[PDB]
């Protein structure tokens, strides 16, 4: 039973059935394909089924470097002692590096513009080509690695390729930590949850379990509520970049050709800085581009990403909403009325009860994204709890966390405090005007924008011999 094309329910296929009055899938014998996540213990009648994490849980830039030894070596430029990551050998972006090409049997990217014959990219994680915006962030970090390694080679002539690689890697890893915990997470959780779930870092605690919890894989998908139905590209005047300034998302999934042949990462990064995120609202949860048209260009039918989230939680055996509420120490609504209070929305409570019958059965993603947002945050209490708890464990339980004593010198720590995603954009692209303040808040050109010349470079002096 081939899950991509069959609608039969046999292991490992758990296809989503089609409701009687579907707006899109008019044929009820059709289905949305779904493969059950690989079990930790295949074919066991003893164990309770659990899923596998293929990556390091640590915030360690594993999406740049890889999480398995063979792939990590493959992403490296092995033709010199310069400690560089491998770059594309056939294509450049205005004289700057692109990600190398990957060699998949069944390459989704070739399906997006057949004539262009541009394959998917190779990165540390397998999803780098899922959207050009994501590819752009990957390309950015590759560039940054190479720049750090270059600079370190000047500072320390006698260091070999192994040392250069490791040191640049350690800095990129620290940058991801800083941007994540200083800039990103406060805007996710809001001030109150940030204080509750992420108090000031003390030291590495070796008794903190740093594993990703199963639920986190589902709750972190709150992000799907932020997705805009277009990819936006802007020229160097931050003007719409001709033609196709607003490309529908359904025409960009795996569209790696767009990066290579439609003008590189610059216009993509500009679009990211100078366009608003979508606001999650209680009757505006997620756009049709992901709910109706996910991967429509590479697959036999458009998938439904919200529906996939819900299917996947069931696949993973996740408890429903009330059980997570109780886990988090929050009240658990029993009735339509009480769910109305918790959601600050009786209409939505009525709708959730009509589907689910009890708040005990609401799937974690659906319940999580339904909750009103915390002041100055983009998750409600439930999601703030799960997300916050996970990031606590990621920081406290990481021996190589950037502020852990003996990881960096004090001067290196001082130097690292100066980094920002805007600075990274300046260092590694043709972009000369970037977002000020907090990159994740600033969104309007010109009001929120600064010249690159105003931003402190990362000073590598304290990495010397």
């Amino acid at each position: 039973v081939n899950c991509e094309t069959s609608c039969v329910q046999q292991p490992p296929c758990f296809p989503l059935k089609i409701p009687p009055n579907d707006p899109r899938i008019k044929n009820q014998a059709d289905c949305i394909p779904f493969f059950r996540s690989c079990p930790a213990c295949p074919g066991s009648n003893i164990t309770i089924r659990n899923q596998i994490n293929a990556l390091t849980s640590f915030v360690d830039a594993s999406m740049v470097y890889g999480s398995e030894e063979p792939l990590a070596r493959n992403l490296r430029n092995m033709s010199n002692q310069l400690g560089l990551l491998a770059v594309n050998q056939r294509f450049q972006d205005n004289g700057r590096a692109l990600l190398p090409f990957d060699n998949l049997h069944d390459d989704p990217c070739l399906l997006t513009n057949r004539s262009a014959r541009i394959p998917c990219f190779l990165a540390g994680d397998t999803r780098s080509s899922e959207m050009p915006e994501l590819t752009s962030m990957h390309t950015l970090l590759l560039r940054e690695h190479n720049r750090l390694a270059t600079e370190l080679k000047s500072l320390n002539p006698r260091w070999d390729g192994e040392r250069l690689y490791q040191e640049a890697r350690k800095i990129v890893g620290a940058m991801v930590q800083i941007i994540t915990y200083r800039d990103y997470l406060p805007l996710v959780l809001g001030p109150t949850a940030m204080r509750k779930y992420l108090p000031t870092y003390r030291s590495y605690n070796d008794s903190v379990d740093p594993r990703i919890a199963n639920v986190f894989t589902n709750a972190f998908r709150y992000g799907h509520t932020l997705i805009q139905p277009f990819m936006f590209r802007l020229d160097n005047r931050y003007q719409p970049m001709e033609p196709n300034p607003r490309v529908p998302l359904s025409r960009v999934f795996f569209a790696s050709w767009r990066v290579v042949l439609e003008g590189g990462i610059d216009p993509i990064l500009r679009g990211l800085m100078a366009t608003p995120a979508k606001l999650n609202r209680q009757n505006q949860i997620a756009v049709d581009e992901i709910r109706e048209r996910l991967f429509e260009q590479v697959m036999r039918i458009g998938l439904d990403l919200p529906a996939l989230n819900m299917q996947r939680s069931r696949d993973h055996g996740l408890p429903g909403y009330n059980a997570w509420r109780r886990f988090c120490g929050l009240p658990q609504p029993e009735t339509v009325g009480q769910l109305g209070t918790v959601l600050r929305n009786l209409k939505l409570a009525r709708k959730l009860m009509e589907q689910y019958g009890t708040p005990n059965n609401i799937d974690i993603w659906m319940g999580g994204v339904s909750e009103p947002l915390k002041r100055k945050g983009r998750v409600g209490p439930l999601l703030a709890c799960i997300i916050g708890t996970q990031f606590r464990k990621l920081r406290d339980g990481d021996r190589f966390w950037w502020e852990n004593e003996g990881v960096f010198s004090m001067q290196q720590r001082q130097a690292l405090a100066q980094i920002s995603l805007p600075r990274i954009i300046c260092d590694n692209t043709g972009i000369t005007t970037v977002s000020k303040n907090n990159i994740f808040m600033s969104n309007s050109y010109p009001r929120d924008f600064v010249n690159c010349s105003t931003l402190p470079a990362l000073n590598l002096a304290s990495w010397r011999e």
Binding site: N74, M78, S79, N80, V87, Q89, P100, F101, N103, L122
Partner: protein
């Protein structure tokens, strides 16, 4: 599975100019993936759908 960027390493292995140190580093990297001679390397490139007609 052979990667397009690895073709550039073949080029370095066939550069009579490129120094012994660099070439032995690359041979070592290919030997780690079960590829012992340049013939074995070209062959893998061919079989993974790359155009090797230059060699």
């Amino acid at each position: 599975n052979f990667l397009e960027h690895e073709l550039s390493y073949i080029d370095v292995l066939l550069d009579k100019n490129a120094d012994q140190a660099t070439k032995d580093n690359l041979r070592s990297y290919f030997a780690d993936k079960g590829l012992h001679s340049i013939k074995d390397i070209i062959n893998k490139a061919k079989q993974d759908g790359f155009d090797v007609s230059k060699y």
